[PDB]
Write a protein that binds this ligand. Sequence first.
Ligand SMILES: Cc1ncc(COP(=O)(O)O)c(CNNC(=O)CSc2ccccc2[N+](=O)[O-])c1O
Ligand SMILES: Cc1ncc(COP(=O)(O)O)c(CNNC(=O)CSc2ccccc2[N+](=O)[O-])c1O
Ligand SMILES: NNC(=O)CSc1ccccc1[N+](=O)[O-]
Lengths: 429, 429
Amino acid sequence: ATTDDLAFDQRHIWHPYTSMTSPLPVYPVVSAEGCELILSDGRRLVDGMSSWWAAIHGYNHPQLNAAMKSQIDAMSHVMFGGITHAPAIELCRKLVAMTPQPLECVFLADSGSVAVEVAMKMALQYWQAKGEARQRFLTFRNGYHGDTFGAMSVCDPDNSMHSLWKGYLPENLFAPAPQSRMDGEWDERDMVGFARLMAAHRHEIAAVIIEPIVQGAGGMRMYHPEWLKRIRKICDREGILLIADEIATGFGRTGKLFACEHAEIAPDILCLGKALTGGTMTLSATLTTREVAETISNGEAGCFMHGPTFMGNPLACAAANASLAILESGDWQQQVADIEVQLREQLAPARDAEMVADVRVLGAIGVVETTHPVNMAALQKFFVEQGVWIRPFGKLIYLMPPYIILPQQLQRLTAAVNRAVQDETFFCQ
Amino acid sequence: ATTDDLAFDQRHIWHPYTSMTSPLPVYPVVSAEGCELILSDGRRLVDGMSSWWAAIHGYNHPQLNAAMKSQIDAMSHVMFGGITHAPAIELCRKLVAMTPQPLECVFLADSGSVAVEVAMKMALQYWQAKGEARQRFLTFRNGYHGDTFGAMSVCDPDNSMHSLWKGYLPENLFAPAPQSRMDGEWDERDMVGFARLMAAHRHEIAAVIIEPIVQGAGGMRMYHPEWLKRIRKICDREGILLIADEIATGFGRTGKLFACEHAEIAPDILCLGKALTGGTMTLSATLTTREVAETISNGEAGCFMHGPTFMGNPLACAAANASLAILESGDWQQQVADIEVQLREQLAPARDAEMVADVRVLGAIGVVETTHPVNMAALQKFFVEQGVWIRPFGKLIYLMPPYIILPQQLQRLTAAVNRAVQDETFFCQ
Ligand SMILES: Cc1ncc(COP(=O)(O)O)c(CNNC(=O)CSc2ccccc2[N+](=O)[O-])c1O
Ligand SMILES: Cc1ncc(COP(=O)(O)O)c(CNNC(=O)CSc2ccccc2[N+](=O)[O-])c1O
Ligand SMILES: NNC(=O)CSc1ccccc1[N+](=O)[O-]
């Protein structure tokens, strides 16, 4: 019965970065609760992914659910043009309140990529209004900022295989990936490439854009906070805008509410998403300073030229309010600290495995980088059999569980990672 | 209280295309039901906008609400990587079934702009996979496809103030706006700019992208269906992909389920959004032909390189299924027909106003085009005070009520429009 469904899905439905010619199997999920995904056949999976960062409160959270159902009773949606409403205002109040002081103007959007493109567009309009046609962005390699064309143009030029897009995408400036680790000692030579690029191009750079501390989808790399302090200083001296993409790192995942706090710096533009809504549905936010906001607004345009149809969607704002309200308890701090400790401890053995190239842990992020890319289909199948949901990518078998994950649940995950990495059959050499 | 909310909104929250220095007043909506928005002060506004096309079932629709809440109970969201679920499969089943026969591959995304960029990426990967680096898009003037950089690059260069983006945005090809009206007869001279551009670049064009029949946000234009027939044949001749952006026209608004049906043509790529979810929340879909899907998939990438975090969001899909299920009753056909009849008759008097340059109606769309741009603040204030919510744009005062609007409700809208165009204080000359 559901095998006819899976057949329709296989034949008609794209999934993220998949082939319609030879799609790989996908598992049917019927529901989810706490930290468990429930398949059609009833088997339960402990979630190690938070549905990619965002589901930090796990699934079927009573408070998120209630907040969503209430907003639906008022209105799930109304347009934002000439109209405002309580959920957008409350959400923005919470966002302005919890972010670094200068960030006080909020542009709500629908997705991470759109938030990034909004940030980029802000930087571009800023310099138009200041009369300097700056159009380049300076970023890091191993960056990932989304799949829309603006966002691609600041993603790593190799990973996004921009070679196939090199011609459509404008060429931005890419400093080397930050090499100094976050459990690292800082090394001053790390700064050399970035500084040179700045020096050679400081006049055409509208903004520097980086994922602070954790380069997520670009490799789950965790680099030294000194990088943010220097880039912040470098940006200040050149008057270049700093765009911090915290779409992945936002709302506590790295042990701090925003990864920028690891460096105690503030961006000129801050992109948020994913866990913003507690992973219930899509929403994003791009915050900026009053200075950027006024400059753009006093430009030739007379406004910031962006407006998604479903901008400020009340239902998503309500879910965010609820998600942010749960974080207000502050329980996430210890939860994330405890997950971090347990991940360091339980993933440590993997360092000795021959298939493992590195193990790094930060907040509720646990990463086992392997020497050869994983055999996706085979390893995915293995994980389901171990009763866990772990979604590896390339040479990364990583964990980012909901903050409410129970220690025995986290244990099942780390045990599954350790067991998988010992065995070379789950890897392609 | 709400006076402090509004002050915070004004001081901190962007709205679509808004200034942070001098924002216009926005009206606080606390809830909505049927075709009415309810402001804080208890006054009810008859909705003439459907929250920009999308809310075709009006507000607080019980079937939508039931679907959304029920789906919340299972899971509002789970990742789509290596996972599929019933709301996504059902929605794709419906979409495949109701769209033109060759369209059978569905890529779910979160917003209209992303759907457009996905369509654009499909075409680009298509030609990259065939080993012909075609990278230019041919579109119409007065077209609108979103605010992201890729979508902007096929937006009208004047409305989009492309003078400010000319430098970052790759330059696409812009045929003249289709001049032949939809209640017009076809004028053969219309084709000259399009044919000449096509002939001059036909080897470097990856795709043609247009809004079928109704160019929405770019000028609420309604052009002759012969255009689709001609563009479809010419695209066939050159083997060029046709992208029909039905994000606005989809799901009945123009009297047919998809505006392409007015010409009985099928695009290679179809974009959907807005009314897709009954306007409950953001979601989009880009459909393509199996030929395109496999060509893309058999390229160097080995896949279609796109995957939003919230791809296939169960909740949005649930809403979409509900919305689509409502249309399955067929009630919309008569509802849209009746609104059309009533719109034509009741907007007719406006033609005689000195301030009115044109009046056009199609399906549940009524456009009163004026000779001068409307005075946004004053006219908006006027409308609210008349108890109607109509959001004019530039030189356009248009109505697109939910399909369920009552006749006495529609009469209030059309009455408000007629009264507004008689008075020139509501215009900037
Ligand atoms: C930091 C950051 N910035 C922007 C975006 C774009 O958000 P969208 O919702 O528009 O995509 C993201 C989103 N990242 N998405 C994911 O985490 C999906 S999984 C993924 C993505 C890319 C490469 C690999 C993987 N993976 O499976 O590990 C963002 O993180
Ligand atoms: C036909 C068509 N295609 C793509 C998009 C992009 O959708 P997003 O959800 O990413 O915005 C749209 C979007 N249309 N948006 C609106 O109707 C908002 S109102 C608007 C937008 C642009 C110019 C003018 C107006 N207006 O106030 O009338 C789309 O329609
Ligand atoms: N891209 N988005 C837009 O162009 C939105 S236009 C708009 C919408 C609602 C209210 C006012 C405006 N406007 O600035 O004219």
